[PDB]
Design an enzyme around this catalytic site. Sequence first.
Site, PDB file in Angstrom:
ATOM      1  N   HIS A 141      -3.568  21.980  79.791  1.00  0.00           N
ATOM      2  CA  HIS A 141      -3.985  20.663  79.279  1.00  0.00           C
ATOM      3  C   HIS A 141      -4.646  19.801  80.337  1.00  0.00           C
ATOM      4  O   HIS A 141      -5.339  18.852  79.991  1.00  0.00           O
ATOM      5  CB  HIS A 141      -2.834  19.917  78.608  1.00  0.00           C
ATOM      6  CG  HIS A 141      -1.980  19.141  79.545  1.00  0.00           C
ATOM      7  ND1 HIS A 141      -0.711  19.555  79.891  1.00  0.00           N
ATOM      8  CD2 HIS A 141      -2.164  17.966  80.168  1.00  0.00           C
ATOM      9  CE1 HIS A 141      -0.152  18.667  80.686  1.00  0.00           C
ATOM     10  NE2 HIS A 141      -1.021  17.691  80.900  1.00  0.00           N
TER      11      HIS A 141
ATOM     12  N   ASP B 140       0.901  26.075  77.317  1.00  0.00           N
ATOM     13  CA  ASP B 140       0.301  25.149  78.274  1.00  0.00           C
ATOM     14  C   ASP B 140       0.337  25.697  79.721  1.00  0.00           C
ATOM     15  O   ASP B 140       1.175  25.273  80.557  1.00  0.00           O
ATOM     16  CB  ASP B 140       0.970  23.768  78.165  1.00  0.00           C
ATOM     17  CG  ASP B 140       0.209  22.689  78.894  1.00  0.00           C
ATOM     18  OD1 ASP B 140      -0.942  22.925  79.279  1.00  0.00           O
ATOM     19  OD2 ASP B 140       0.787  21.601  79.071  1.00  0.00           O
TER      20      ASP B 140
ATOM     21  N   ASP C 135      13.022  12.208  85.510  1.00  0.00           N
ATOM     22  CA  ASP C 135      12.147  13.100  84.739  1.00  0.00           C
ATOM     23  C   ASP C 135      10.869  13.338  85.531  1.00  0.00           C
ATOM     24  O   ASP C 135      10.580  12.603  86.484  1.00  0.00           O
ATOM     25  CB  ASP C 135      11.802  12.409  83.400  1.00  0.00           C
ATOM     26  CG  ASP C 135      11.178  13.325  82.319  1.00  0.00           C
ATOM     27  OD1 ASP C 135      10.990  14.553  82.461  1.00  0.00           O
ATOM     28  OD2 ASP C 135      10.980  12.752  81.213  1.00  0.00           O
TER      29      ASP C 135
ATOM     30  N   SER D 130       1.727  17.179  85.632  1.00  0.00           N
ATOM     31  CA  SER D 130       1.422  18.411  84.915  1.00  0.00           C
ATOM     32  C   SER D 130       0.870  19.457  85.833  1.00  0.00           C
ATOM     33  O   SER D 130       0.028  19.170  86.725  1.00  0.00           O
ATOM     34  CB  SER D 130       0.425  18.208  83.811  1.00  0.00           C
ATOM     35  OG  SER D 130       1.065  17.441  82.807  1.00  0.00           O
ATOM     36  N   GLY D 131       1.307  20.699  85.592  1.00  0.00           N
ATOM     37  CA  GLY D 131       0.811  21.807  86.371  1.00  0.00           C
ATOM     38  C   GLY D 131       1.675  22.096  87.565  1.00  0.00           C
ATOM     39  O   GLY D 131       1.643  23.208  88.098  1.00  0.00           O
TER      40      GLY D 131
HETATM   41  C1  LIG Z   1      -0.754  16.539  81.743  1.00  0.00           C
HETATM   42  C2  LIG Z   1       0.567  16.195  82.422  1.00  0.00           C
HETATM   43  O1  LIG Z   1       0.239  15.461  83.557  1.00  0.00           O
HETATM   44  C3  LIG Z   1       1.522  15.484  81.568  1.00  0.00           C
HETATM   45  C4  LIG Z   1       2.937  15.642  82.001  1.00  0.00           C
HETATM   46  C5  LIG Z   1       3.983  14.820  81.214  1.00  0.00           C
HETATM   47  C6  LIG Z   1       5.430  15.291  81.467  1.00  0.00           C
HETATM   48  N1  LIG Z   1       6.237  14.330  80.767  1.00  0.00           N
HETATM   49  C7  LIG Z   1       7.662  14.355  80.885  1.00  0.00           C
HETATM   50  N2  LIG Z   1       8.359  13.366  80.171  1.00  0.00           N
HETATM   51  N3  LIG Z   1       8.290  15.221  81.625  1.00  0.00           N
HETATM   52  N4  LIG Z   1       1.488  15.866  80.200  1.00  0.00           N
HETATM   53  C8  LIG Z   1       1.016  14.975  79.171  1.00  0.00           C
HETATM   54  O2  LIG Z   1       0.664  13.814  79.407  1.00  0.00           O
HETATM   55  C9  LIG Z   1       0.974  15.528  77.811  1.00  0.00           C
HETATM   56  C10 LIG Z   1      -0.357  16.074  77.651  1.00  0.00           C
HETATM   57  C11 LIG Z   1      -0.593  17.335  76.810  1.00  0.00           C
HETATM   58  C12 LIG Z   1       0.262  18.420  77.028  1.00  0.00           C
HETATM   59  C13 LIG Z   1       0.077  19.624  76.372  1.00  0.00           C
HETATM   60  C14 LIG Z   1      -0.975  19.777  75.528  1.00  0.00           C
HETATM   61  C15 LIG Z   1      -1.848  18.728  75.320  1.00  0.00           C
HETATM   62  C16 LIG Z   1      -1.666  17.487  75.980  1.00  0.00           C
HETATM   63  N5  LIG Z   1       1.174  14.634  76.806  1.00  0.00           N
HETATM   64  C17 LIG Z   1       2.509  14.138  76.567  1.00  0.00           C
HETATM   65  O3  LIG Z   1       3.396  14.469  77.334  1.00  0.00           O
HETATM   66  C18 LIG Z   1       2.676  13.224  75.432  1.00  0.00           C
HETATM   67  C19 LIG Z   1       3.021  13.970  74.235  1.00  0.00           C
HETATM   68  C20 LIG Z   1       1.906  14.765  73.590  1.00  0.00           C
HETATM   69  C21 LIG Z   1       1.660  16.058  73.958  1.00  0.00           C
HETATM   70  C22 LIG Z   1       0.618  16.835  73.424  1.00  0.00           C
HETATM   71  C23 LIG Z   1      -0.213  16.274  72.479  1.00  0.00           C
HETATM   72  C24 LIG Z   1       0.026  14.990  72.087  1.00  0.00           C
HETATM   73  C25 LIG Z   1       1.054  14.228  72.658  1.00  0.00           C
HETATM   74  N6  LIG Z   1       3.567  12.187  75.662  1.00  0.00           N
HETATM   75  C26 LIG Z   1       3.365  11.133  75.778  1.00  0.00           C
HETATM   76  C27 LIG Z   1       2.319  10.593  75.768  1.00  0.00           C
HETATM   77  O4  LIG Z   1       4.255  10.343  75.904  1.00  0.00           O
END
Ligand SMILES: *C[C@@](*)(O)[C@H](CCCNC(N)=[NH2+])NC(=O)[C@H](Cc1ccccc1)NC(=O)[C@@H](Cc1ccccc1)NC(C)=O
Lengths: 249, 210, 143
Positions: free
Chosen positions: A41, A90, A181, A187-188
Site C-alpha cells: 500500500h 499488503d 501501537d 507501514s512496511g
Molecule cells: C501505510 C502505513 O503507513 C499505514 C500503517 C498504519 C498502521 N496502523 C496501526 N493502527 N497499527 N497504513 C495505513 O494508513 C492504511 C493504509 C492501507 C493499508 C492497506 C491497504 C490499503 C491502504 N490505512 C489504515 O490503516 C486505515 C484503515 C484502512 C485500510 C485500508 C483501506 C481503507 C482504510 N486506518 C485508518 C485510517 O485509520
Amino acid sequence: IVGGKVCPKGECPWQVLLLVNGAQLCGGTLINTIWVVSAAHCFDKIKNWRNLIAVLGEHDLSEHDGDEQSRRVAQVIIPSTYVPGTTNHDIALLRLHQPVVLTDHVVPLCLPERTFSERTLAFVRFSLVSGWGQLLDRGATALELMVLNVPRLMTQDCEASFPGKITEYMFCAGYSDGSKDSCKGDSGGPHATHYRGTWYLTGIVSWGQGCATVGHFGVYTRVSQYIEWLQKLMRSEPRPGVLLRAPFP
Amino acid sequence: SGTTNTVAAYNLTWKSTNFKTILEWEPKPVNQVYTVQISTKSGDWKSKCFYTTDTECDLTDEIVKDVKQTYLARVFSYPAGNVESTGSAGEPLYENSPEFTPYLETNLGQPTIQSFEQVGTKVNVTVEDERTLVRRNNTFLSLRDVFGKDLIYTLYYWKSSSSGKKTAKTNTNEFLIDVDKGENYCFSVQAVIPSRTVNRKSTDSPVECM
Amino acid sequence: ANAFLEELRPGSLERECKEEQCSFEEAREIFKDAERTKLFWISYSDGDQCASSPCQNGGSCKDQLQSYICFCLPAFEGRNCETHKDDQLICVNENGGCEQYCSDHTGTKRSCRCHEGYSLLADGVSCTPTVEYPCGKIPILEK
Ligand SMILES: *C[C@@](*)(O)[C@H](CCCNC(N)=[NH2+])NC(=O)[C@H](Cc1ccccc1)NC(=O)[C@@H](Cc1ccccc1)NC(C)=O
Ligand SMILES: *[C@@H]1O[C@H](CO)[C@@H](O)[C@H](O[C@H]2OC[C@@H](O)[C@H](O[C@H]3OC[C@@H](O)[C@H](O)[C@H]3O)[C@H]2O)[C@H]1O
Ligand SMILES: *[C@@H]1O[C@@H](C)[C@@H](O)[C@@H](O)[C@@H]1O
Ligand SMILES: C[N+](C)(C)C
Ligand SMILES: C[N+](C)(C)C
Ligand SMILES: C[N+](C)(C)C
Ligand SMILES: C[N+](C)(C)C
Ligand SMILES: C[N+](C)(C)C
Ligand SMILES: C[N+](C)(C)C
Ligand SMILES: C[N+](C)(C)C
Ligand SMILES: C[N+](C)(C)C
Ligand SMILES: C[N+](C)(C)C
Ligand SMILES: C[N+](C)(C)C
Ligand SMILES: C[N+](C)(C)C
Ligand SMILES: C[N+](C)(C)C
Ligand SMILES: C[N+](C)(C)C
Ligand SMILES: C[N+](C)(C)C
Ligand SMILES: C[N+](C)(C)C
Ligand SMILES: C[N+](C)(C)C
Ligand SMILES: C[N+](C)(C)C
Ligand SMILES: C[N+](C)(C)C
Ligand SMILES: C[N+](C)(C)C
Ligand SMILES: C[N+](C)(C)C
Ligand SMILES: C[N+](C)(C)C
Ligand SMILES: C[N+](C)(C)C
Ligand SMILES: [Ca+2]
Ligand SMILES: [Ca+2]
Ligand SMILES: [Ca+2]
Ligand SMILES: [Ca+2]
Ligand SMILES: [Ca+2]
Ligand SMILES: [Ca+2]
Ligand SMILES: [Ca+2]
Ligand SMILES: [Ca+2]
Ligand SMILES: [Ca+2]
C-alpha cells in the site's frame, strides 16, 4: 509509532526508510544486500517511480552522520492478488539498484522458514515494531527511529475487534488498552521476533483503525504466508518494469 | 455436523490442590485430539500435552515456577490422524481458560494432626507440615515454606462428656490448649489462609482423640 | 467390629475403629453426638485412594478426601506421573530444542538446521555464524 521509545542507533539495523522525491514515504525491512520487504500500500499513490529511494543505516532524519546508505529502488514487486485501497496481501518486495554494504549499522533481518514461523515464532508473545511514522494518530512523524514491543494475538482473539476483517494473510498485535501501537508512516516496517538469540521477520506494519485506539489492535501482514513467494522471487530471472505483479501463491 | 473437522474445547477448569494443578475440559476426543498452551500473562506460550486424547493436562511443573504469577492456558483441537491440518494461517481452533493465580487459588489439602501430648491440664496438638508440589532446588517445599505467615491453623476440640465445641488458632503448626483433667478430648483442624477472598479454608482433618 | 458379647463393653475408638473396622453405629456409640460422629466418619469412611497405587514412575501418592495427589520425580509429570518430560522431542515442543530450524522425520530423531550464514555445531542443536554480518544479529551490541 505511538508509545514507543527511540531505537538506539544500530539496534534496529534492518530498518529501511523509503523516500519519494526526497519525502518520507514508508518503512521497510532489509532481508539481504539487494532486497527489502515493505507494504504494497506504500505504492498505491506513486507516479514518480524514478525518484523512489531506500535508505539503510538511517536513524536521525535531521542529519547525515555517514552510516546512511541510499539506493534507488529498481523494482517493486507486489502480489497478483493485491488490490490498491484494500487491505489484503499488503506486502511488496523491493530490488535495490545496487547492493548495500553490511556494516554494524546495516544488517538484514532473517526471513524464517514458514513452519518455524508458524510453530515457534508465532508463540513468542512480544515482538518489536519500528519506524519513523506518526507519534500519535493524526500527529507528527518522528525524526529519530522509534521502536515498541507489542504482544501478538491469535486471530480468534482479534476477531471481535475487526469482525470478518482479519484474513489468513494478517495478524493482530498490540494493546486494546490503547497505550501503544504502530501508526501511519510505519507501514512496511518490521514486526521482528526474537528466538534463542536471533531475530526474524514475522510481520509487516499494514493497517489499523486509527492508532492506539481502545478496543483495537494493529494489523500486520502475516509474513509466514509469503515466505515461498519471496524466496522464489529472489531467485528468479528479473523481468522488466519498475512495478511488477507476481503470481500469488 | 458431519462437515465439521474439529470443535473447540469448552468448560475449561482448573483443578488444583497443594499446587498440583491440572487443567480439564470437554469434549471427549471426537475425531480430534488436543494440545495445551500455558503462559504467564506477559510471558511466552509453552505447549504441553501434545496431540492427546486426554481431556486433562498437568500444568503443575509450569505453574510452580512462580506461584505468584497469573497463568493463562488454552486448548487447541486438531483433526484426528491429520494433526498438521490446521488451516492456512496455521491457527487451530481453540478455547481460553480462566486466569489462574496459584498462590491465591490452589486448594489447601486436607490436613492431618500429627500428634498430641498432654501433661496435666495442658495439651500440645501438632499439625503435619505437609509437602506441596512447589520445588526449590531438589526439594519439595512444605505448606509453611510456601505461605509463611499467610497460613494459620484452626482447632476444633471438644470434651466427650459435654456438648459445645471449643476453638483455638495458631500462626504455626502447633497449639497449646488448656483441658480439664479426667476428660477425654477430641480434635480436628483446618488450614486457613485468612488473606484469601476465595478457597480460604481446607476441609476438616480426620478426628483424633485422647 | 462386633463379636459375640463384645458389645456388653463400653465403646472404644482404639479397640473398635483403629484395631478393627467399625460401622457408623459403632462409631456413634463412641461419640454419642450425631454431628461429632459425622465429622469423624467423613474421613474414617473415605478410604485410601492411594491403595490402588496410582502414581507411576517412582512417584509418591498422598491420599486426600475422595482423591489423591501424586508427587513425581523430577523427570516426570502428569496426574499419575505418567508423562516423561524428556520424551516428546518434536518440533512443536519448544522447537525440538533446536536453536533455529527443526524438522520432524519419519523414522528418525528430529534434526536441527541453521539459516544461511550459520552452521550447526557439534551439539546438534546450536548454530554459529559463518559470515561477518549474519542475519538477525545486532553487531553493535555484540562487540
Ligand atoms: C501505510 C502505513 O503507513 C499505514 C500503517 C498504519 C498502521 N496502523 C496501526 N493502527 N497499527 N497504513 C495505513 O494508513 C492504511 C493504509 C492501507 C493499508 C492497506 C491497504 C490499503 C491502504 N490505512 C489504515 O490503516 C486505515 C484503515 C484502512 C485500510 C485500508 C483501506 C481503507 C482504510 N486506518 C485508518 C485510517 O485509520
Ligand atoms: C486407584 O488407582 C486407579 C488407577 O489405576 C485410579 O483411577 C484411582 O483414582 C481414581 O478414582 C479415585 C478418585 O479419587 C480419583 O480422582 C480424584 O483423585 C485424583 C485427582 O487427581 C482427581 O481430581 C480426583 O477426582 C481417580 O483418579 C485410584 O484410587
Ligand atoms: C515419594 O516422593 C517421590 C518424589 C519419590 O521421592 C519417592 O521415592 C518417595 O517415596
Ligand atoms: C538533508 N539533511 C536534512 C540530512 C541535512
Ligand atoms: C544522501 N546520503 C545519505 C546518501 C548521503
Ligand atoms: C541515490 N543515488 C542515485 C545516488 C544512488
Ligand atoms: C474496498 N474495501 C476497502 C472495502 C475492501
Ligand atoms: C477497510 N477496512 C475495513 C479494513 C477499514
Ligand atoms: C500448539 N500449536 C503450535 C499447535 C498451536
Ligand atoms: C517491554 N515489555 C515489558 C513489554 C516486555
Ligand atoms: C478464544 N475466543 C474465541 C473465545 C476468543
Ligand atoms: C475496558 N475497555 C477499556 C477495554 C473498554
Ligand atoms: C522481548 N525480548 C527482547 C526479550 C525478546
Ligand atoms: C468452567 N468454569 C467454572 C471454570 C467456568
Ligand atoms: C486433583 N487435583 C488437581 C486437585 C490435585
Ligand atoms: C499481554 N498483555 C498483558 C498486554 C495482555
Ligand atoms: C495422549 N496420551 C498420552 C493420553 C495417549
Ligand atoms: C477466558 N478469559 C480469560 C477471558 C476468562
Ligand atoms: C511428636 N511431634 C509431632 C511433636 C514431633
Ligand atoms: C509470600 N511469602 C511466602 C513470603 C509470605
Ligand atoms: C465444626 N467443624 C469442625 C466442622 C468446622
Ligand atoms: C508452641 N506453642 C503452641 C506455644 C506456640
Ligand atoms: C470419646 N472418646 C474420647 C473416648 C473417644
Ligand atoms: C452399656 N454400655 C455398652 C453403653 C457401656
Ligand atoms: C491423609 N489424610 C489427610 C487423608 C488423612
Ligand atoms: Ca541521518
Ligand atoms: Ca470389637
Ligand atoms: Ca463393637
Ligand atoms: Ca460398640
Ligand atoms: Ca479386637
Ligand atoms: Ca492398639
Ligand atoms: Ca453396638
Ligand atoms: Ca446402638
Ligand atoms: Ca482418602
